[PDB]
Design an enzyme around this catalytic site. Sequence first.
Site, PDB file in Angstrom:
ATOM      1  N   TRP A  64      -9.120   6.415  -0.483  1.00 20.00           N
ATOM      2  CA  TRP A  64      -9.652   7.264  -1.608  1.00 20.00           C
ATOM      3  C   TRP A  64      -8.519   6.773  -2.781  1.00 20.00           C
ATOM      4  CZ3 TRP A  64      -8.225   9.962   2.854  1.00 20.00           C
ATOM      5  CH2 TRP A  64      -6.889  10.401   3.033  1.00 20.00           C
ATOM      6  N   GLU A 117      -4.899   3.927 -10.539  1.00 21.98           N
ATOM      7  CA  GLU A 117      -5.764   3.014 -10.493  1.00 21.98           C
ATOM      8  C   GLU A 117      -7.064   2.911 -11.458  1.00 21.98           C
ATOM      9  OE1 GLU A 117      -6.282   1.401  -6.031  1.00 21.98           O
ATOM     10  OE2 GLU A 117      -6.001   3.466  -5.922  1.00 21.98           O
ATOM     11  N   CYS A 142       1.003  -1.294  -0.036  1.00 22.81           N
ATOM     12  CA  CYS A 142      -0.073   0.097   0.077  1.00 22.81           C
ATOM     13  C   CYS A 142       0.798   1.383  -0.061  1.00 22.81           C
ATOM     14  CB  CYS A 142      -1.119  -0.019   1.278  1.00 22.81           C
ATOM     15  SG  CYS A 142      -1.867   1.469   1.422  1.00 22.81           S
ATOM     16  N   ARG A 182       0.230   4.678   2.847  1.00 26.37           N
ATOM     17  CA  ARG A 182       0.026   4.375   4.238  1.00 26.37           C
ATOM     18  C   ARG A 182       0.588   5.709   5.292  1.00 26.37           C
ATOM     19  NH1 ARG A 182       4.076  -0.488   4.627  1.00 26.37           N
ATOM     20  NH2 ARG A 182       4.378   0.007   2.555  1.00 26.37           N
TER      21      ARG A 182
HETATM   22  C1  HEM Z   1      -6.284   6.252   2.368  1.00 23.99           C
HETATM   23  C2  HEM Z   1      -5.937   6.623   1.085  1.00 23.99           C
HETATM   24  C3  HEM Z   1      -5.273   5.224   0.363  1.00 23.99           C
HETATM   25  C4  HEM Z   1      -4.529   5.245  -0.823  1.00 23.99           C
HETATM   26  C5  HEM Z   1      -4.075   6.411  -1.777  1.00 23.99           C
HETATM   27  C6  HEM Z   1      -4.027   3.798  -1.147  1.00 23.99           C
HETATM   28  C7  HEM Z   1      -3.538   3.172  -2.140  1.00 23.99           C
HETATM   29  C8  HEM Z   1      -3.200   2.271  -2.620  1.00 23.99           C
HETATM   30  C9  HEM Z   1      -3.067   1.583  -3.784  1.00 23.99           C
HETATM   31  C10 HEM Z   1      -2.629   2.358  -5.159  1.00 23.99           C
HETATM   32  C11 HEM Z   1      -2.910   0.261  -3.628  1.00 23.99           C
HETATM   33  C12 HEM Z   1      -2.676  -0.676  -5.025  1.00 23.99           C
HETATM   34  C13 HEM Z   1      -4.030  -1.328  -5.217  1.00 23.99           C
HETATM   35  C14 HEM Z   1      -3.938  -2.252  -6.448  1.00 23.99           C
HETATM   36  O1  HEM Z   1      -3.127  -2.004  -7.386  1.00 23.99           O
HETATM   37  O2  HEM Z   1      -5.083  -3.118  -6.339  1.00 23.99           O
HETATM   38  C15 HEM Z   1      -3.148   0.106  -2.597  1.00 23.99           C
HETATM   39  C16 HEM Z   1      -3.060  -1.329  -1.701  1.00 23.99           C
HETATM   40  C17 HEM Z   1      -3.672  -1.694  -0.746  1.00 23.99           C
HETATM   41  N1  HEM Z   1      -4.014  -0.973   0.478  1.00 23.99           N
HETATM   42 FE1  HEM Z   1      -4.040   1.168   0.323  1.00 23.99          FE
HETATM   43  N2  HEM Z   1      -4.692   3.082  -0.385  1.00 23.99           N
HETATM   44  C18 HEM Z   1      -5.228   3.817   0.772  1.00 23.99           C
HETATM   45  C19 HEM Z   1      -6.188   3.366   1.721  1.00 23.99           C
HETATM   46  C20 HEM Z   1      -5.726   2.012   2.463  1.00 23.99           C
HETATM   47  C21 HEM Z   1      -6.618   1.739   3.684  1.00 23.99           C
HETATM   48  C22 HEM Z   1      -7.520   2.556   4.694  1.00 23.99           C
HETATM   49  C23 HEM Z   1      -6.173   0.474   3.878  1.00 23.99           C
HETATM   50  C24 HEM Z   1      -6.478  -0.579   4.767  1.00 23.99           C
HETATM   51  C25 HEM Z   1      -7.074   0.059   6.260  1.00 23.99           C
HETATM   52  C26 HEM Z   1      -5.328   0.029   2.782  1.00 23.99           C
HETATM   53  C27 HEM Z   1      -4.464  -1.114   2.663  1.00 23.99           C
HETATM   54  C28 HEM Z   1      -4.242  -1.854   1.473  1.00 23.99           C
HETATM   55  C29 HEM Z   1      -3.798  -3.072   1.136  1.00 23.99           C
HETATM   56  C30 HEM Z   1      -3.920  -4.265   2.154  1.00 23.99           C
HETATM   57  C31 HEM Z   1      -3.430  -3.021  -0.106  1.00 23.99           C
HETATM   58  C32 HEM Z   1      -3.195  -4.462  -0.859  1.00 23.99           C
HETATM   59  C33 HEM Z   1      -4.251  -4.928  -1.494  1.00 23.99           C
HETATM   60  C34 HEM Z   1      -4.027  -6.236  -2.241  1.00 23.99           C
HETATM   61  O3  HEM Z   1      -3.198  -6.903  -1.986  1.00 23.99           O
HETATM   62  O4  HEM Z   1      -5.086  -6.458  -3.360  1.00 23.99           O
HETATM   63  N3  HEM Z   1      -5.116   1.103   2.113  1.00 23.99           N
HETATM   64  N4  HEM Z   1      -3.528   0.888  -1.651  1.00 23.99           N
HETATM   65  C1  LIG Z   2      -8.173   1.143   0.212  1.00 21.16           C
HETATM   66  C2  LIG Z   2      -7.821   1.134  -0.913  1.00 21.16           C
HETATM   67  C3  LIG Z   2      -7.263   2.524  -1.316  1.00 21.16           C
HETATM   68  C4  LIG Z   2      -7.123   2.560  -2.887  1.00 21.16           C
HETATM   69  N1  LIG Z   2      -6.461   3.708  -3.348  1.00 21.16           N
HETATM   70  N2  LIG Z   2      -7.054   1.113  -3.722  1.00 21.16           N
HETATM   71  C5  LIG Z   2      -7.501   0.079  -3.017  1.00 21.16           C
HETATM   72  C6  LIG Z   2      -7.618  -0.905  -4.218  1.00 21.16           C
HETATM   73  C7  LIG Z   2      -9.062  -0.800  -4.741  1.00 21.16           C
HETATM   74  C8  LIG Z   2      -9.393  -1.956  -5.879  1.00 21.16           C
HETATM   75  C9  LIG Z   2      -8.325  -2.732  -6.351  1.00 21.16           C
HETATM   76  C10 LIG Z   2      -8.750  -3.637  -7.438  1.00 21.16           C
HETATM   77  C11 LIG Z   2      -7.908  -4.643  -7.920  1.00 21.16           C
HETATM   78  C12 LIG Z   2      -7.830  -4.509  -9.452  1.00 21.16           C
HETATM   79  N3  LIG Z   2      -6.399  -3.994  -9.921  1.00 21.16           N
HETATM   80  C13 LIG Z   2      -6.092  -4.878 -10.971  1.00 21.16           C
HETATM   81  C14 LIG Z   2      -6.516  -2.667 -10.298  1.00 21.16           C
HETATM   82  C15 LIG Z   2     -10.187  -3.513  -7.946  1.00 21.16           C
HETATM   83  C16 LIG Z   2     -11.093  -2.715  -7.551  1.00 21.16           C
HETATM   84  F1  LIG Z   2     -12.157  -2.289  -8.075  1.00 21.16           F
HETATM   85  C17 LIG Z   2     -10.462  -1.833  -6.437  1.00 21.16           C
HETATM   86  F2  LIG Z   2     -11.389  -0.776  -5.984  1.00 21.16           F
HETATM   87  C18 LIG Z   2      -7.984  -0.097  -1.988  1.00 21.16           C
END
Ligand code: HEM
Ligand SMILES: Cc1cc(N)nc(CCc2cc(CCN(C)C)cc(F)c2F)c1
Lengths: 411, 416
Positions: free
Chosen positions: B286, B291, B114, B117
Site C-alpha cells: 500500500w 509517493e 523499502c 519492511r
Molecule cells: C506493505 C506496504 C509497503 C510500503 C508502505 C512500502 C513503501 C515503499 C516506498 C515508499 C518505497 C519507495 C518507492 C519509490 O520511491 O519509488 C518502496 C520501495 C521498494 N519496496 Fe516497499 N513498500 C511496501 C511493500 C513492499 C512489498 C510488499 C515489497 C516486496 C515484496 C516491497 C519491496 C520494495 C522494493 C524492492 C523497493 C525498491 C523499489 C525500487 O528500487 O524501485 N515493498 N517501498
Molecule cells: C510494493 C510497493 C509499495 C509502495 N508503497 N510503493 C511502491 C513503489 C510504487 C511505484 C513506484 C514508482 C516509481 C516512480 N517514483 C519516481 C515515484 C512509480 C509507480 F507508479 C509506483 F506505483 C511499491
Amino acid sequence: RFLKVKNWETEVVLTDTLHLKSTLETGCTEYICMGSIMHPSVATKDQLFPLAKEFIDQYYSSIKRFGSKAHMERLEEVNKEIDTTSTYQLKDTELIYGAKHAWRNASRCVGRIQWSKLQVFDARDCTTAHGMFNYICNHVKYATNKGNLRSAITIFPQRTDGKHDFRVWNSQLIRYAGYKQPDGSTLGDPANVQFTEICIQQGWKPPRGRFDVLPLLLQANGNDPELFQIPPELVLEVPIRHPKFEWFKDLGLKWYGLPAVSNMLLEIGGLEFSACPFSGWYMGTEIGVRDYCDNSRYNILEEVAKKMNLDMRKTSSLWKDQALVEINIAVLYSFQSDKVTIVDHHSATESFIKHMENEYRCRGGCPADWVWIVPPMSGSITPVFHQEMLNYRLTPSFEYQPDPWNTHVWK
Amino acid sequence: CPRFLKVKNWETEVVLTDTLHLKSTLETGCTEYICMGSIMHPRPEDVATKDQLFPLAKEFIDQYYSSIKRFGSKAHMERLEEVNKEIDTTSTYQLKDTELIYGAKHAWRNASRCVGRIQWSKLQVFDARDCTTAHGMFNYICNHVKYATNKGNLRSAITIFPQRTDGKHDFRVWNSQLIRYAGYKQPDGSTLGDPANVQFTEICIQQGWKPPRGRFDVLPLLLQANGNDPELFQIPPELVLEVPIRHPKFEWFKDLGLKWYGLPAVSNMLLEIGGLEFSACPFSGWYMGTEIGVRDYCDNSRYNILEEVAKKMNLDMRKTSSLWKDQALVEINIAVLYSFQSDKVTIVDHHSATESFIKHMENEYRCRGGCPADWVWIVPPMSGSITPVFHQEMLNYRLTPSFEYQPDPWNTHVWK
Ligand code: HEM
Ligand SMILES: Cc1cc(N)nc(CCc2cc(CCN(C)C)cc(F)c2F)c1
Ligand code: HEM
Ligand SMILES: Cc1cc(N)nc(CCc2cc(CCN(C)C)cc(F)c2F)c1
Ligand SMILES: C[C@H](O)[C@H](O)[C@H]1CNc2nc(N)[nH]c(=O)c2N1
Ligand SMILES: C[C@H](O)[C@H](O)[C@H]1CNc2nc(N)[nH]c(=O)c2N1
Ligand SMILES: [Zn+2]
C-alpha cells in the site's frame, strides 16, 4: 575509468574524471556503503614530503606554470625545510589557494558556487589567546559587514608536535547557551548544554536566558583555554516575525546572522591547521528546520502549530509539515526585512546545480554528498534531489577533529 | 572487513551494532575511494552455469534450514543432495513451496530501499510457476490485484511466474507497474496524462491499444510468456480501485479533477532466490502518501500541479523565498491522505511509516544482527528532518534473496 552522473528530472548526464585524482578513503567498500554515516572512521618528515610535493605540484599546475623555475625552486625549498625542521611553512599565495580549494572540495557544502570569493585572514603569527580573540573579533566584524555578509576564514598556526595546538573550543563562533533546568528540562539551545557548563565552570556568569550568546573559549599553543566576551555591537541578530501572522513576533524568537564553523581542521599540503574559523551566510533551513524544529534543539513545532490552531491529534493531518513551512517563511522574511544576507533552499540548490555544471566542464567533476546537499525539507521540489552525485575526498580539505575537552591535559 | 560496525541515531543517541553486513553477497557500486550511494542504478542470454549455481543453491538452502531450526538435519542434508543432483542432471533446480515463500519474504526483508519492511513476514505469496501463456499470466495478475485490493483494505502480495531457463524463454510483465496511467505526447510538445509513461504508452499503441487519450487512462497489461512476443490485456475496470482527491478545507480542490489508483504494484523487478532468476514477480503493498502527493503530483516531469494549486491558494509566486511551492506541497499531501482515509483505502503518512521503520530497524538489529537500509531512498521526499529516519545512520549492503533491476524488455526482446 570515467563515471557518469545523471539528473533524472532534466536527463542531463555529466562525466566525472576528477575522482581519479583522489587518494583518501571514503569509508565505503565494494560491499558496504557508509554514505549516511556522519563520521566514518601527528605527521613525520617521511609522511610529510609527498603530501607537500603533491600540493605544490597542483598549485603550480593551477597557475599554469608546471615545471617552471619557480616550481622547481619551491620543491627544493620545501625539501630542505621538512628535512631540517620536521615541517614547512606555506607561502601566502599557497595559503590562500589552499583555503579556497578546501572549500571547493567540501563535498557537504551546498554553497560552493562562491568558493573563489573567500577572504583569507593569515593569523599564523598568533601566540596567545588574547591574540586569537583579537583576530576573531576582526573576522566577525569583517564578515558581518553590517548585514552584507562576506565569506571569510582566519587561519591560526599549524600543528607542530600535537602538544601546542591552537584550538577554538566553541564549535561555532556565535551560539546560544543551553541550561539544564532543576525540573529536568532545558533552557536555551540543548545542543550546547555541555559546552555552556564548561563556560560556567570556567568563570562565565550566565544570564540564564533563552538566547545568551556564549563567550569564546580560546586555546593558544596548547595552554589552558581562556574566556572572552565578543563585544555585543559585533553580534548581529534578527528578531523573527511572520509576514501574515502578527502573533509570531510574540513567540520571542531571534537568531544570529553569522554562521561560523570553528571546530574543524584545515589540511593543506600535509600541514594541519587545527584552528581555522570560517564563516559564510545562512541557508534559511539551517535555522528554521534544524535549529528550531529538531526535537533535540529548540523544538518549537508544537507551539507554532498551537497558535496556528491546527488539529494535532493525528500525524496524518500533517500539522508538523504545515507549521514547518510557516516557520521557514518567517526566517527568510525576517533576515530579508533587516537586509541580512540569507539564501532560501530553492535558490541555494539551484545555484549548486549551476556550480556542478561549471565544475564538470572546467574541472572534470565535483565531489558532492547528496545526504548533506539535499535540504532537510521539501527535498524533491529542489533540483538537487534529482541529481546523481559522486562523493570522493580531495585535498586540501576540511576534516573533523576530536572535541578539545576530551584530549586537553590541563594544568 | 571489520566484524562489528556501529550506527548512531543523532537525535536519540541510540547506538546499534551490525554484524549482518558480513553476509553481504553482491556489490554496492562504491569503492574505497568513491561513494555511489546516490546513483539510482549503480546480457540476459547469459544464464548461470552448473558451477556458479551449486554454491548459490547451497548458500540459500543452508539459510533456509537454519531459519527453521533444522540446520544439519537429515532433511537438510537430503535436500542439499537432491538439489545438487538436479543441477547436475538438468543444469537447474526447482524450489519447494516452503522455500519459494521463504525466499520471497526475505527478498522483501532485504530490500534496502523499502521503508515498509516492518510488514515483511505478512506477505501472501501466489505460486504461478505452472503458468504457460500470456492469457494465464493475465488470470494470475487479475487474481493478485483483486486479492491485494480487498475492497480498500489492502494486503501485500507477490505473484511468482516461472524462473528463467536458457534466457530465450523469459516470462516478463512489460509494464513497470501493474496499474499506471497513460501519457500522450502532443504535436505541440505538451503531454496529456502522466509524462513518465509516454514511452510505454506508445508501445501499447503500436501493439494495438486504442487509447482514449485522457488524463487518467489505466494502461493495458503487456504480458510475455515463455519468451514469446507480449500480448495486450485490459484490466477489468472494476478491479482498479481509484480515489478522487479532495481537500478537507479547500472546496475548490476537487475541481482540479485529480484522482489516483489505490494499489502500488511493482512489476519490472527480478527476484533472485538461491541463484534462480524469477524475471516476472509482480509485488504490491500500500502507498505512503508522499509517493503520490510529492512525486507523482509535484515532480516537474510528472503531473506538475504545484503552479495550479498555488494559484487557487492565491500565493505570492514571484519570489521563491515566499516558499509558495513548499506551502502548496503540504496542502496537496494533506488532500491525498484525507481522500484515501475518507474512502477507507489503506494509506500511510510519512510520519507513521518512518517511525515504524525505526522500530523495525531496531528489532532487526537486535534479532538478526542488522538491517540494510538506503538512507537516500528511506528518507521521505518532503519534511525530511522532521521524520526520525533523517537522523538515523544506516548501513547499506546487498543480501540475497533479493529484488534486482533488469533491462527493459523492449530493449532485449527478440521479436518472433
Ligand atoms: C506493505 C506496504 C509497503 C510500503 C508502505 C512500502 C513503501 C515503499 C516506498 C515508499 C518505497 C519507495 C518507492 C519509490 O520511491 O519509488 C518502496 C520501495 C521498494 N519496496 Fe516497499 N513498500 C511496501 C511493500 C513492499 C512489498 C510488499 C515489497 C516486496 C515484496 C516491497 C519491496 C520494495 C522494493 C524492492 C523497493 C525498491 C523499489 C525500487 O528500487 O524501485 N515493498 N517501498
Ligand atoms: C510494493 C510497493 C509499495 C509502495 N508503497 N510503493 C511502491 C513503489 C510504487 C511505484 C513506484 C514508482 C516509481 C516512480 N517514483 C519516481 C515515484 C512509480 C509507480 F507508479 C509506483 F506505483 C511499491
Ligand atoms: C557562502 C555561503 C555558504 C552557504 C550558503 C553554505 C551552506 C552550507 C550548508 C547549508 C551546509 C550544511 C551545514 C549543516 O547542516 O551543518 C554547509 C556545510 C559546509 N560548508 Fe558551506 N556554506 C557557505 C559557505 C562556506 C564557507 C565560506 C566554507 C569554508 C571556507 C564552507 C565550508 C563548509 C563545510 C566544510 C561544510 C561541511 C561542514 C560539516 O561537515 O560539518 N561553507 N554549507
Ligand atoms: C560556513 C557555513 C555556512 C553556513 N550557511 N552554514 C554553516 C553550518 C553552520 C552551523 C552548523 C551547526 C551544526 C548544527 N547542526 C547539528 C544542525 C551549528 C551552528 F551553530 C552553525 F552555525 C557553515
Ligand atoms: C544520519 C545522517 O547522516 C545525519 O542525520 C545527517 C543527514 N544529513 C544532514 N545534512 C545536513 N546538511 N546536515 C546534517 O546535520 C545532516 N545530518
Ligand atoms: C539522484 C537520487 O538518487 C534520486 O533522485 C533518488 C533520491 N531518492 C529517492 N527516494 C525514493 N524513495 N525514490 C526515488 O525515486 C528516489 N530518487
Ligand atoms: Zn557508499
